[PDB]
Amino acid sequence: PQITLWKRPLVTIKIGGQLKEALLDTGADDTVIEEMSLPGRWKPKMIGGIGGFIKVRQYDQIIIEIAGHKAIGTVLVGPTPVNVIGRNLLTQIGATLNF
Amino acid sequence: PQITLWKRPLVTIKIGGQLKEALLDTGADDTVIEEMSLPGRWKPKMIGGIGGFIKVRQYDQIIIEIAGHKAIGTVLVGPTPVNVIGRNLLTQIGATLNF
Numbered sequence: 001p002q003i004t005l006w007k008r009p010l011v012t013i014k015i016g017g018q019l020k021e022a023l024l025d026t027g028a029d030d031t032v033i034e035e036m037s038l039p040g041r042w043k044p045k046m047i048g049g050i051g052g053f054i055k056v057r058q059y060d061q062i063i064i065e066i067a068g069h070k071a072i073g074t075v076l077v078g079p080t081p082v083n084v085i086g087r088n089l090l091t092q093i094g095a096t097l098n099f
Numbered sequence: 100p101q102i103t104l105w106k107r108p109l110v111t112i113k114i115g116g117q118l119k120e121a122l123l124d125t126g127a128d129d130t131v132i133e134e135m136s137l138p139g140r141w142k143p144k145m146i147g148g149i150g151g152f153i154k155v156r157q158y159d160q161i162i163i164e165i166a167g168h169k170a171i172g173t174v175l176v177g178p179t180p181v182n183v184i185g186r187n188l189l190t191q192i193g194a195t196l197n198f
């Protein structure tokens with residue numbers, strides 16, 4: 001598909017057995033998902049952007065379906081107002097920016 | 100061009116007659132540039148990112164060249180750690196996300 005950028009590029013994702021809306025975010029190094037009770041071990045991390053840093057839980061090898069495309073990788077869980085799909089997973093679904 | 104996402108999608112921009120590096124960011128509503136002297140009238144604004152809200156200077160109708168493509172639009176100047184080109188300008192240069 002082609003997604004224009006007039007509106008936020010939000011898509012449906014499946015993670016941990018749940019459907020969520022998430023932002024396809026070329027400016028994010030990492031994938032950051034709103035607080036949710038994922039099972040398994042995790043590592044503390046701090047991630048930054050405009051306004052400073054937040055504390056998140058780093059989960060490895062998490063399966064996520066993004067707009068119908070399967071991916072597996074690192075997902076950071078913490079208090080974000082928007083679920084962010086970053087480049088670690090955008091590459092797995094073969095996403096490009098075109099102009 | 101077609102830009103893949105294994106690396107940050109950094110391009111050269113020209114703003115205020117000056118060359119800078121900036122990130123093409125589909126997740127950003129707005130464009131935020133690091134502190135600089137910029138010709139024009141501005142007004143104070145706040146904007147929020149992953150780590151909270153910051154104060155910025157809002158400059159309207161600023162000419163900016165992005166990877167050789169022209170845009171004229173709003174630029175927010177403030178203590179952003181990375182120059183970010185958001186959807187307000189990505190739409191002007193015809194950028195889309197594809198997968």
Ligand SMILES: CC(C)(C)NC(=O)[C@@H]1C[C@@H]2CCCC[C@@H]2CN1C[C@@H](O)[C@H](Cc1ccccc1)NC(=O)[C@H](CC(N)=O)NC(=O)c1ccc2ccccc2n1
Nearest residue numbers: 027028029030047048049050126127129147148149180181
């Ligand atoms: C630019 C602005 C208009 C303020 N918009 C946003 O910031 C929106 C805010 C939304 C709601 C909060 C949750 C994030 C989303 C997406 N973001 C866009 C979004 O694309 C944002 C843009 C950005 C890039 C780099 C540095 C600063 C800001 N990316 C990020 O916040 C990601 C998050 C992460 N993966 O760790 N940050 C980075 O990838 C990143 C890269 C290099 C850096 C160097 C030093 C310090 C921090 C750095 N952070």
